[PDB]
């Protein structure tokens, strides 16, 4: 970008969950789909930390729905391997993909079974 630190601080905000700082950086026009060195997106840092309110303020900022990390895993794969159903729902409403897979060859659905997160594995049985 052109001074993509407003996006870097955006990444740290989406990760640690700095609520008002999100609003501030999006007021600062921060790079909504800025990524780290490892391809992670604010959705990646969010699902890791479970700030669903911040997930939604980022959706106000407007990042991607099916972005994957440099490790090919989307935050759908993350949340499958996490267990926060309520955070999963907002992306199915945002139109996530059901039949895709990460660079590891399994549909993110089975990643719920990775932790046995049947809460979200159920949600992924509904759509196709």
């Amino acid at each position: 970008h052109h001074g993509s630190d407003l996006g870097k601080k955006l990444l740290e905000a989406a990760r640690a969950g700095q609520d008002d700082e999100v609003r501030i950086l999006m007021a600062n026009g921060a790079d909504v789909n800025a990524t780290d060195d490892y391809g992670h997106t604010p959705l990646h840092l969010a699902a890791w930390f479970g700030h669903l309110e911040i997930v939604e303020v980022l959706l106000k900022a407007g990042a991607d729905v099916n972005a994957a990390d440099w490790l090919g895993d989307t935050p759908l794969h993350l949340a499958a391997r996490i267990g926060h159903l309520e955070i999963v729902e907002v992306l199915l409403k945002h139109g996530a993909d059901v039949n895709a897979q990460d660079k590891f060859g399994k549909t993110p659905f089975d990643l719920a079974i990775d932790n046995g997160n049947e809460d979200i594995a159920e949600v992924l049985q509904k759509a196709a």
Partner: protein
Amino acid sequence: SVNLEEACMERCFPQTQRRFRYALFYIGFACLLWSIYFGVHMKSKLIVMVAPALCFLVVCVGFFLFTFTKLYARHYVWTSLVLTLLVFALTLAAQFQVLTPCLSQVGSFSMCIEVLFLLYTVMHLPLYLSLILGVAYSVLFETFGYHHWELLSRALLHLCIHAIGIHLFIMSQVRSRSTFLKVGQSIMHGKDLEVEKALKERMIHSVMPRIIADDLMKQGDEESENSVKPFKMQQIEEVSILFADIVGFTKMSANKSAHALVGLLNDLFGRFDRLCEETKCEKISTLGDCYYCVAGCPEPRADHAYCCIEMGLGMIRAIEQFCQEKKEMVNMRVGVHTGTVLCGILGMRRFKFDVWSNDVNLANLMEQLGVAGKVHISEATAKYLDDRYEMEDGKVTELKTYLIAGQFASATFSSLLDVLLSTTVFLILSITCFLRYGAASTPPPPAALAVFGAALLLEILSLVVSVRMVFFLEDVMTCTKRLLEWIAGWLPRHFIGAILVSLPALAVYSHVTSEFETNIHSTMFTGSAVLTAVVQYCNFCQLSSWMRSSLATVVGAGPLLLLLYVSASLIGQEVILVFFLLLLLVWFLNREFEVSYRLHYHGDVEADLHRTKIQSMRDQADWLLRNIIPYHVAEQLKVSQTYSKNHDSGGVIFASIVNFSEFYEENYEGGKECYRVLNELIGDFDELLSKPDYSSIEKIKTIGATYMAASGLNATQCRDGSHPQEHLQILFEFAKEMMRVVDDFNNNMLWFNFKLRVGFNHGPLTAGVIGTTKLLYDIWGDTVNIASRMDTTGVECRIQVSEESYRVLSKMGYEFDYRGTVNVKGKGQMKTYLYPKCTDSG
């Protein structure tokens, strides 16, 4: 520079002989057209001239057919001397028989100028010598033109024509030197660059097997071979994982010459390479008292296990034939095990080709459970033993295993030089043109002083242009320089120079506008001077050829075909002949010289090409060296056959990724990208290694996912300015820092914190180098396997430390918590500590 600048002329010969051949031809044509002139138009009243003409013709063609002879290849100097003296005499004699009133002095002067040239350009005569001959000829001819102004006017014409003579000389001489020299350097680079290719290929293939380096030496994906100033990993099934450790190594390595064991070991391993090449198996690495190859990795072989096992058996014969040779009876345990393995490369520093799987550690274990002399094979191996050997259900004497016992001259220097030339000679030319004035005291004609001033202006400003593009004094402003010179490119130079060397012809034309022909001395004179000026059109050679020469023709001669229309009568005919032939000269002479400059520019392009190409290959291959071997030690095989050395204190640390083995789960096909992540951190480690505060640290290699480090070894120069015991301190500091590094790394790794267990020892060691026609570095001694067992039995996130290293670092000040005194193989109990203090709740 004598013996060399002999071969120089010995190489530049055939062009010189070509020039001689053409000059001969031209002399022929000139004397002959003189003859037909004298035999038809005028001078039908004597043979005193024409028989000399034809005799000169025939002696010339005699030289001409001569030039192919063998007792001339070293005598072109003396041959030219002969010919030039001959033509000297010819011209002067065909001159003296004048000054009665029917052969003009201008014709004599054409002869003078032209022979003076073909003395300068083509003769290839020594500078001093061609010079003295030029001036002697000059003065003598002008005297034989004598038998208070006009005389010295003609003398000045001689002077200027000698000027352009010598300048033209030294220019052509240094040019055909420089091109020779650059072609010399170019061929040096040809051979030197093939050589560096060979060396770089050697080193590369001594770090990766055949197929992979063959694959990556075509650089089909140009972005991968940028780490060589990245790579791909592949998983292969049905492999043969052979091992070996020197049984009782410490004992058979109790006391050696720090070189003896080195050498004999080199011997054994060269043997084992000689074995694998026959079994077509890929040797892989050597861990100290160990060694191991693999098989079936690049090409899974139908009988990969067979080549492997029979190769091992051959190693048994090799080891016994050396034990009963140098009288040291230590064979080696052998563990063989099949299965699947993902191979590839990791790291960017000291990185090497390697392999990873459970099967890897499995074969190592089956080695540890292997009996000295025989192999503890697996059932995964036995699945196609085809029962052709000594199969025995070898089990631990304490799963599905068996025991088998067998059976100058810069193209901008030329600019200032030849513009100096044009300006000074135009100067003295117009000096003459004025010097005609003894009858009209103040110089009347207006166009004269007009063009004189105009030329003075242009020449002096352009000369200053050049002197400041050369010596860069910056009188007034500097940014303006980069702006205006910028214009003077390939074409603007064209036209500035066109005007710049045209101006002396116009100089001489300024004085002629008057009616003068009534005096025929003035016409004779101005004819002489215009032919001088037209000869000045040879100098500016960094310009075009056809253009500059056609400008010569037109704007030197055309106006004399114009004063052909002042009708001073048939002197017109003699002048059109002399200019016809003189112009023939200037044409072919000039085009030849532009060939010379063209070729010199080319032969500097190409030498620069190979210059940067050798620099590319040199940085590449030398840095590849520093990839494999450190520099200080890099001297000793560059200069000798081998190297070895003892260090009595060097810290060694392993570091593995234990919880990788879990997050290894191969739900992803191949697990490759997990190893990509490992490699990520390995890089992040090399990133450390390149730090100068990390100077004394040396990664030794990367085994599995481990990390071998050492220190206190390179910097032998004990200066007053340090405390030698520092190396362990900065070492362990680096250790703690990379420990923080894996943490930082894990802040990024999704929902996984990869933890590392680290061991330690310090003390004596042996540095050594193994491969020849290959290369490998390594260390031995107590300390290596000591710390190896340490981190083999360490607890993660807590730096295990050897007791005496614990002591030296405690007396350095570092905080440690006791771990336990656990038995050490071959050593007994040993007090272990951990560095992390209250890192956990316990």
